Copies of this chain bind each other. A is one copy, B any other.
């Protein structure tokens, strides 16, 4: 029911994937480094309470009548619901507070990729908070109260709600399906694979940026799906796009979802074949994304897709080579990348006296 907040690493990366997401990018409006550090400390105090299912500050009620309550109250009576709060720092943060020479080289700007149609207003950001929980109101409450605590020092640049599986009704070892109807997550780095996490996800001291040791790098892409076009494709076209069948999710020519793929049996521009580590010099990613459905656009089409999140030890050797290799992906006909951001996710909060960003700000 709760996930420990403290550790060598931030929670919400290798910890079990929760049913819901509220992801928010913030822009910083203060130039005062001391005021920003103060905020990080207050945010960390609030996060400790939130992830344990307690209200922030003095609480949501019972205080002075003439004062606004410290907590806005909409999570009263709810459980912690495995809430994790994961903070990250965008490249643009390092132009402030004299941090320019502390930007990690692994926090690389992404190139323009073919077919990008990025909405500037739903891209970038000085920092992010990823709120994952099994109850979406727990996640929203966390973001709403962090933004309220930060008011005057940060503003919300963009936000995205997402959903995965509903654990109360769906088994844990069942692979969830994305909104194209295919199982999504079969060949991924699991949180149990400590060695693969050290190799592919966690920043190491020898990587060149000491304050990031134990952190990770996050790529976020809001990927719209062209639902109505996809739904008019034949079953064979859909399966040819991925290289797996739709019902079982087995690789072509195999029987079971978890059978290892035979890449030469897939079409040359099939998604799995292009994204597989063997096709990318061994590049391997921790995918931790969520489906979204925001409504319908002005043409009646479903505004839906995948809020893709990938964690890696170095953006240059993780997301960039794989996404570059998708230049000819058969899936490109049915998707469009419309938002993007990258973040350096710092190491964990070690104990009750530590605070978000302490290794960077000291």
Contacts and interface: CB of A to CB of B under 8 A. Distances in A.
Interface stretch (A77-85, A205-213, A277-285, A341-349): A77-85
Given A144-B302, A174-B77, A136 B169 contact: no
Contacts of A177: 73-77, 137
A264 interface: no
A158 interface: yes
A296 B163 CA distance: 16
Interface in A149-165: 155-161, 163-165
A158 to B, nearest CB: 6
Contacts of A72: 179-181, 227, 231
A359 interface: no
A111 interface: no
A168 interface: yes
Interface residues of A, number: 76
A69 interface: yes
Tell me what chain A mostly uses at the interface: helix, strand, loop, or mixed.
loop
Contact of A67 (B122, B181, B235): B235
Contact of A164 (B66, B69, B137, B155): B137
A186 interface: no
Given A155-B300, A296-B159, A302-B144, A81 B235 contact: no
A236 interface: yes
Interface in A36-88: 60-69, 72-79, 81
Nearest to A169: B79
Given A140-B179, A164-B136, A168-B134, A247 B78 contact: no
A245 B140 contact: no
B296 A157 contact: yes
Interface stretch (A287-295, A320-328, A329-337): A287-295
29 contacts: A22-B293, A61-B247, A65-B234, A67-B235, A69-B181, A69-B238, A72-B180, A72-B231, A74-B177, A74-B181, A75-B177, A76-B177, A76-B181, A77-B170, A78-B166, A81-B169, A135-B169, A136-B164, A137-B163, A140-B304, A144-B304, A147-B301, A147-B302, A155-B300, A156-B300, A157-B296, A161-B293, A161-B295, A294-B294
